Amino acid sequence: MRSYDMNVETAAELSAVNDILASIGEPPVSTLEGDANADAANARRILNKINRQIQSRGWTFNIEEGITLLPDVYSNLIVYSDDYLSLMSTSGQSIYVNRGGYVYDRTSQSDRFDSGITVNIIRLRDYDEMPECFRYWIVTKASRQFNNRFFGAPEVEGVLQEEEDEARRLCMEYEMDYGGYNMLDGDAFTSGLLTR
Amino acid sequence: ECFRYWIVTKASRQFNNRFFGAPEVEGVLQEEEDEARRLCMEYEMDYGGYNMLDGDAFTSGLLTR
Amino acid sequence: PKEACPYIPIRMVRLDGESYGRSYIEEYLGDLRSLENLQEAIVKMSMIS
């Protein structure tokens, strides 16, 4: 699992943590560097948790289709990193699982590959790499969970519940606009049925 | 990753019920587990790739002409 | 003779400048494909049911 607190802070990550701190009324911090601020450290942990959770759900922008994972030539092992939020097959039923930190073919009962495998993969990205609407949803969900766990204010709980639903709605609008999905000619099955 | 979140969410909910006991935390974690299970159910279908026409054990035989 | 060749090539639907004729079915092959798609889906639905 990637360490959230071991790299330099970005401006957006500084903004996100302070937004989470604001949810319970904590004043903003100038830096995420260790100042013994338990609240800021807790907020960053929840920010990382929510960042991993929403990305792992799967969206057109972050789902990578047709990605090749190359094996080591001498060990024939493909690493299944903890930053692989989702690893699927390109079509049909998926055959690859995680076994000991390496890719395992459950149908062939083998973890040895002579060549790269093509998978539909979600790889963890920085919160800085998220779209603006997705950043807002991550912060809103992190703020809601932060208040529930470390303050518990029931009035704050209700408003952040509504804010997250609105934040998730606008992320769904982004995903549909980004996807540009068509059930007539963008459809795997129906587009073939349209040929005359 | 989705299953890890569901395990952690469900473990947190059971931990609160057993070793914290705050009822407002219970309602929060009940909501989170329901969402956490929903995303794992989405993962199961995407991984499963199940088809009732040709992937079906019985209907696939019925489709032969 | 030009007019009495025992080999008679027949064209169902003759187009200008074409050595061969078009079939009558190909004028409606589009509807046949569309009906084929519907009929396949209707039968396959019954097989699920």
Curated annotation (Swiss-Prot), chain B:
Superkingdom classification of source: Viruses
Compartment(s) of residence: Virion
Self-association state and partner proteins as the record states: Interacts with head-to-tail connector protein gp8, the tail component gp12, and the fiber protein gp17.
Entry similarity comment: Belongs to the tail tubular protein gp11 family.
Function, as annotated: Structural component of the short non-contractile tail. The tail complex is involved in viral genome delivery. Forms the 12-fold symmetric toroidal domain immediately below the connector protein gp8. Once the tail tubular structure is formed, the interface between gp11 and gp12 generates the proper environment to interact with the six fibers, each made of gp17 trimers.
Protein name, entry field: Tail tubular protein gp11
Curated annotation (Swiss-Prot), chain C:
Signal peptide (UniProt feature, chain positions): none
Domain of life: Viruses
Localization per record: Virion
Family assignment from sequence similarity: Belongs to the podoviridae portal protein family.
Function: Forms the portal vertex of the capsid. This portal plays critical roles in head assembly, genome packaging, neck/tail attachment, and genome ejection. The portal protein multimerizes as a single ring-shaped homododecamer arranged around a central channel.
Quaternary structure, from the entry: Homododecamer. Interacts with major capsid protein. Interacts with the tail tube protein gp11. Interacts with the terminase large subunit. Interacts with the internal virion protein gp14.
Protein name: Portal protein
Entire protein: shown range: 245 to 293 of 536
